[PDB]
């Protein structure tokens, strides 16, 4: 499967007219472009080596679109303030996520268009790309207004055409990078926990992509409950880290095994505590 998403944020600043606007583009969950109005010279910038292939025309067009989005978000932020009867001053946020998912057949599988106000669902385009889903009363106002304008058709055309077109291009351009894997480097640590009990922590480091599965087994059985799994976190160099631990009776560490599953592993790893 594959995907492309553009995550945009506009933040109202007390004592300022233009909001802070930030847009980040992703291909298969990897950041590849970015725009920030707070920069000295607001411009879309490459964030993946394979984007240096795009000519000056590409950046020019993208940067213009951003300038447009800034104004759209600015006017919209103003409107919502009235819809919710919020006092002037204060800071508010408007976000948007748009994009498309391709299936195994590399053909369109689904388009997305969602807006959030104050970090909460506002209005979203349904999978049919024709109808809107409003999360609350204020959003119903926007929905009713957009049903009249055929706003959905506009977005539908981008999600089935342009989105699809560029995702294929980026996939073709950044292929050697996007499709690569860095299989995990794993090991098991041993730590004191309490009276007659110790912790075994199974680490998985420097892997890519982020998706991964770690499990613990006692006597051939899975330890879903009793297993503490941290949230996957970035190493900061493009790769990820994760660990899973279990508390065990001191003197039985050897009865436990950790398994690591990852796309870069044709066969899962099997680790044990090693004194």
């Amino acid at each position: 499967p594959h995907s492309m998403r553009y995550f945009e944020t506009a933040v109202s600043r007390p004592g300022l007219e233009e909001p802070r606007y930030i847009s980040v583009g992703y291909v298969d969950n990897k950041e590849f472009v970015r725009f920030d109005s707070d920069a000295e010279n607001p411009r879309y910038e490459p964030r993946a080596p394979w984007m240096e292939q795009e000519g000056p025309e590409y950046w020019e067009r993208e940067t213009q679109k951003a300038k447009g989005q800034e104004q759209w978000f600015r006017v919209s932020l103003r409107n919502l303030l009235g819809y919710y009867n919020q006092s002037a001053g204060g800071s508010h946020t408007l976000q948007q996520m748009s994009g498309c998912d391709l299936g195994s057949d590399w053909r369109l599988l689904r388009g997305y268009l969602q807006f959030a106000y104050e970090g909460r669902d506002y209005i979203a385009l349904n999978e049919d790309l024709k109808t809107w889903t409003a999360a609350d009363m204020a959003a119903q106002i926007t929905r009713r207004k957009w049903e009249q304008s055929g706003a959905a058709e506009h977005y539908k055309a981008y999600l089935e055409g342009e989105c699809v077109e560029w995702l294929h291009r980026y996939l073709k351009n950044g292929n050697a990078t996007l499709l690569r894997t860095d299989s995990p480097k794993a090991h098991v640590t041993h730590h004191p926990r309490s009276k007659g009990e110790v912790t075994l922590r199974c680490w998985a480091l420097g892997f890519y992509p982020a998706d991964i599965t770690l499990t613990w087994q006692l006597n051939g059985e899975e330890l879903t409950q009793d297993m503490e799994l941290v949230e996957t976190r970035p190493a900061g160099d493009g790769t990820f880290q994760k660990w899973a631990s279990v508390v065990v009776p001191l003197g039985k560490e050897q009865n436990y095994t950790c398994r690591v599953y990852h796309e870069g592993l044709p066969e899962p790893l099997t680790l044990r505590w090693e004194p």
Binding site: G68, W72, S76, N79, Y117, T142, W146, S149, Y158
Partner: peptide, 11 residues
Amino acid sequence: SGVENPGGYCL
């Protein structure tokens, strides 16, 4: 390539 929200279609 990002989407462009219709100019006359704000929230």
